[PDB]
Amino acid sequence: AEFVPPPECPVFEPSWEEFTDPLSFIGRIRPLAEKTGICKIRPPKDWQPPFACEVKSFRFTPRVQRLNELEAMGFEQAVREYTLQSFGEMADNFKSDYFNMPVHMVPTELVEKEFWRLVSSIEEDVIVEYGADISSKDFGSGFPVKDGRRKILPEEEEYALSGWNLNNMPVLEQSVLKVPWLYVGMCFSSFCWHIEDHWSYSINYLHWGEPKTWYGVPSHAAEQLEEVMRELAPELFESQPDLLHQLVTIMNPNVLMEHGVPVYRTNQCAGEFVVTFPRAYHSGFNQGYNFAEAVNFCT
Ligand SMILES: *CC(=O)Nc1cccc([C@@H](OCCN2CCCCC2)c2cc3nccc(C(=O)O)c3s2)c1
Ligand SMILES: [Mn+2]
């Protein structure tokens, strides 16, 4: 049976007045978005920050991902070093060869349907690479920053100072007595179901490239998801602590939905934000070559 797409999560298109600061805006949409776990935010059309990464020196060794590693229960090691350009050439070549069509012509529903088929397939072993958890301290943030390590044009200063610049999000949690991370995706590269440390918010910006497909669960269903996950996880992993079990928490959203867990989806396109709410489980995969930046923040 083919994959059944979950219902779409909320998308907000704030006016320039509503777009003044993200913390106030997120607070206002909370009564709705908290009930879906994730939401998408489309900035005004004229809000277009420039890409400020040091592309000439951008080099990384992505992690290798075998889509059916869990159902299939011979080592592929992270030895291939890429540049942004060489990874993109590999990524586009992989996708165009896999689907036998230009990368921009593959429907998002088809990649989604094929991703979940491959995750459970025992006869077909598809292996991809993900440039995940690249620190913005290594080659700079995708957003312009007033660091002095790179030049900022006068038309770019407003983005260096914008509250929607992920480098300007509040990250200090209140108690008695962090930098954004970068993600260089390719088709089928993915992240498993998880929540954030300290049940923190997270905000995610797709700088460019093909969409990032998300799945989200509202926080009121967090314990229901955890029960389903442990009931259906392999018995060898069933008793592992949450922080370790999250390393293998691959699960088809339809399986969660069949067990009563509400799940929402979205395709995050270039230039759009995705916000995850406290204790909102989320997962996803990339439709193709793209570049994302993310940070956890607190209210
Ligand atoms: C099962 C599995 O392998 N899951 C997986 C794979 C790759 C990367 C990640 C995870 O990266 C760790 C997050 N990082 C920052 C926070 C502290 C721990 C280290 C990812 C988590 C998210 N969350 C939202 C979006 C994305 C994304 O766009 O890739 C990711 S990646 C988990
Ligand atoms: Mn996350």
CATH of the domain at 233: 2.60.120.650
Please give the number of the atom of ligand 1 that sits closest to the Cα of 212: 28
User: CA–CA separation, 241 vs 210, rounded Å?
Assistant: 34
Torsion of CA 49, 55, 57, 60, to 10 degrees: 90
For every residue of the chain, DSSP letters joined together read ----PPPBPPEE---TTTTS-HHHHHHHHHHHHTTTSEEEE---TT--PPP-S-TTT-EE-PEEEETTTTT------S---EEHHHHHHHHHHHHHHHHTS-GGGS-HHHHHHHHHHHHH-SS---EEEEEEEEEHHHH--SS--SSSSS---GGGHHHHS-TTSGGGS--PPP------EEEEE-TT-EEEEE--GGG-EEEEEEEEES-EEEEE--GGGHHHHHHHHHHHS-TTTTTS-HHHHGGG----HHHHHHTT---EEEEE-TT-EEEE-TT--EEEEESSSEEEEEEEE--
Calculate how far, in angstroms, residue 16's C-alpha sits from the geometric centre of ligand 1.
31
User: CA–CA separation, 132 vs 177, rounded Å?
Assistant: 34
> Residue 202 carries which side chain, given as an amino acid letter?
S
Q: Are 81 and 129 in contact (CB under 8 A)?
A: no
Experimentally, the structure was elucidated by X-ray
* Token pair listed for 148: 């002095």
- Give the residue among 219, 218, 242, 220 at the shortest CA–CA distance from 229: 242
194 is in an annotated binding site: yes
- Give the residue among 165, 153, 216, 126 at the shortest CA–CA distance from 22: 165
What domain range is 296 assigned to? 1-299
* Token pair listed for 68: 């059916």
User: CA–CA separation, 47 vs 49, rounded Å?
Assistant: 6
- Give the residue among 232, 231, 223, 236 at the shortest CA–CA distance from 195: 223
Number of domains observed in the structure of the chain:
1
282 is in an annotated binding site: yes
Pairing, β 11-12 against β 38-41: parallel
Residues with CB under 6 A from ligand 1: 130, 132-133, 181, 183, 191-192, 204, 212, 247-250, 292, 294
User: Which residues lie below 8 Å from residue 86, measured CB to CB, with a gap of 6+?
Assistant: none
